[PDB]
From a paper:
Leishmania, a widespread and important protozoan pathogen of humans and animals, requires cysteine for protein biosynthesis and as a precursor of trypanothione, a glutathione–spermidine conjugate unique to trypanosomatids with an essential role in redox metabolism and antioxidant defence. The parasite can also produce cysteine from serine in a two-step process. Firstly, serine acetyltransferase (SAT) generates O-acetylserine (OAS) to supply the substrate for the second stage, which is catalyzed by the pyridoxal phosphate (PLP)-dependent cysteine synthase (CS; EC 2.5.1.47). This de novo pathway for cysteine biosynthesis is found in plants, bacteria and some protozoa, but is absent from mammals.
The structure of LmCS was determined to a resolution of 1.8 Å. The biologically active unit, a dimer, constitutes the asymmetric unit. A surface loop from residues 214 to 241 is disordered and is therefore missing from the model. The LmCS subunit contains two domains. In addition, residues 307–333 at the C-terminus form an extended helix–loop–helix structure that stretches across the surface of the partner subunit. However, the crystals were colourless and there was no electron density to indicate that PLP was present. A fragment of the crystallization agent PGA-LM is bound in an ordered fashion to the same region of both subunits of the LmCS dimer. The interactions between carboxyls from PGA and the side chain and main chain of Thr83 and the main-chain amides of Asn82, Ser274 and Phe273 are common to both binding sites. The binding of PGA may have contributed to the absence of PLP and the unresolved loop between residues 214 and 241 in LmCS. In LmCS, the placement of these two residues ensures that the active site is considerably widened with respect to that found in orthologues of known structure.
Residue numbers in the entry:
A (entry chain B): 4 to 214, 241 to 333
B (entry chain A): 3 to 213, 241 to 333
């Protein structure tokens, strides 16, 4: 349990997790409390930092990654790939990312900042092209290891070990409902398991955006436009600046917070990622378009 | 009994400002000194200026100089100071107007506008001076408008004397031999130096300059090319992702770390801003130009 107030970290690893929790304030006009678990405050700005750490930590203990021998091969360019590149670099591993050429230049650049080898695959073959290429690499080099196997193996576990228990402690053992995205790669499974291990009867709600069954009490559907509108209202009302998945979660949480049986209760949801990564994407396009056509004051007004 | 954000739920994103982590430089430090990085990049809006933003609103309100829902906050800033004022202003219900030259990036316009700030553009030729002139015109024309710079002057050093400096003191276990930060303005330098000397520290105070004066023991000049190179080395060695200022500070720290008299000693410096804000600027153009020319694997190698 690393205490940031009284210590200097040996490694940026130690700054992963132990993220803040924040009550929704202006945007919450309901009779329920809504707690945001702020995973956007991780060192590389998303929840997936916990997964990147888990992969290196747990696979090394298993002897399946060997620092400075293993080449880590990851067929994904989103936050899991960012965290693997980030933490691979400081542990001494070469990291290869395979990604379609059609993924954004900005995604390429962030991965390369950490010294990953970025290998581009044909747009017309999509995500499958990148998976084929990763497999080609591992077949050719017996030192190379596919990361996605470990992402699958450890993801729910790290959230049952860390994220879930943090929420339990931060809310002082008071969670009536926990809400997160159904996507997997996320916190849903592990947080749900942690809560159920603590005794908690909390309602578990999976959020499914639109264009383990035992663990999930309800799937709540959220329209894309509502997730996007919510992300922008959240920043203006409460100063929380996040991506699409956080907007969808907050939209869902605010609806569920108005249910009669949720009055006086505590609802917890996740803010997975900081918003700045998405400024150039469709999420904030409306704002980009607005600022693109602003007028300019004439110099004749400014030279008195 | 001061709020513990790792163990309790915050009422406001304000409470998550400051109390940032501190991190030892390792792979990049091949000296016999210890270099501690104060990780201001970990603030809620990804820079040290969150502390100044908060100090401005909190202290101006307590002195009746800003009145929520009445005062219009006006700032001439193409930097993080404007970003923080816009971010925290929105939460508190203030209208915020930011003036900046038309030559600043769309990304920067977009960030401010995400908070709901009014963005006013001034001629490229007149630079920041023209943005300053316009801010003063706006304030002249609205009796509810106030110029934020006056507050930044009054409160900048004080907030770092009260918060950043005492944090550094506790985090290093009362053990600081040298403190290094940028002259700029908005820097931590004056306030931290005052805190350190108040708490009995004999730390040497070093002002970093590109190529209160009585608290400074040494000016250290850093060429821009060394600042830029150092920013990119930092990501790949230690996973620290920052801007130009942090690059320059770390370069200076590493050179001071080589002095015989610093053997065994503790040097503290500041990482002011997270690097993501700068990914599409000149600082990381070397990486961008590289990933924009990568070859694409031929479909024939992967089509199944
Ligand atoms: Cl998100
Ligand atoms: Cl910086």
């Amino acid at each position: 349990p690393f205490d940031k107030s009284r210590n200097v970290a040996q490694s940026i690893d130690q700054l992963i997790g132990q993220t803040p929790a924040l009550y929704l304030n202006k945007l919450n006009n309901t009779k329920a409390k809504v707690v945001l678990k702020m995973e956007c405050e991780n060192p590389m700005a998303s929840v997936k930092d916990r997964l990147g750490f888990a992969i290196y930590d747990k696979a090394e203990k298993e002897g399946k990654l060997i620092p400075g021998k293993s080449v880590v091969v990851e067929s994904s360019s989103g936050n899991t790939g960012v965290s693997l590149a980030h933490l691979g670099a400081i542990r001494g591993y070469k990291v290869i990312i395979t990604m379609p050429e059609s993924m954004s230049l900005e995604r390429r650049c962030l991965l390369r900042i950490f010294g990953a080898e970025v290998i581009l695959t044909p747009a017309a073959l999509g995500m499958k092209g990148a998976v084929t290429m990763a497999k080609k690499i591992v077949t050719a080099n017996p030192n190379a290891v596919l990361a996605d196997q470990f992402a699958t193996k450890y993801n729910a576990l790290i959230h049952e070990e860390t994220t879930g228990p943090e929420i339990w402690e931060q809310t002082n053992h008071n969670v009536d409902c926990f809400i997160a995205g159904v996507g997997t790669g996320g916190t849903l499974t592990g947080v749900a398991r942690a809560l159920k291990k603590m005794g908690s009867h909390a309602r578990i709600v999976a959020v499914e955006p639109m264009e383990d069954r035992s663990l999930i009490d309800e799937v709540f559907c959220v329209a894309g436009d509502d997730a996007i509108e919510t992300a922008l209202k959240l920043t203006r009302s409460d100063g929380v600046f996040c991506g699409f998945s956080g907007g969808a979660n907050v939209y869902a949480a605010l609806k569920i917070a108005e249910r009669p049986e949720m009055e006086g209760k505590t609802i917890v949801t996740i803010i997975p990622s900081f918003g700045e990564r998405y400024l150039s994407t469709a999420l904030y396009r409306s704002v980009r378009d607005e600022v693109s056509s602003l007028p300019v004051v004439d110099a004749s007004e400014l030279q008195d």
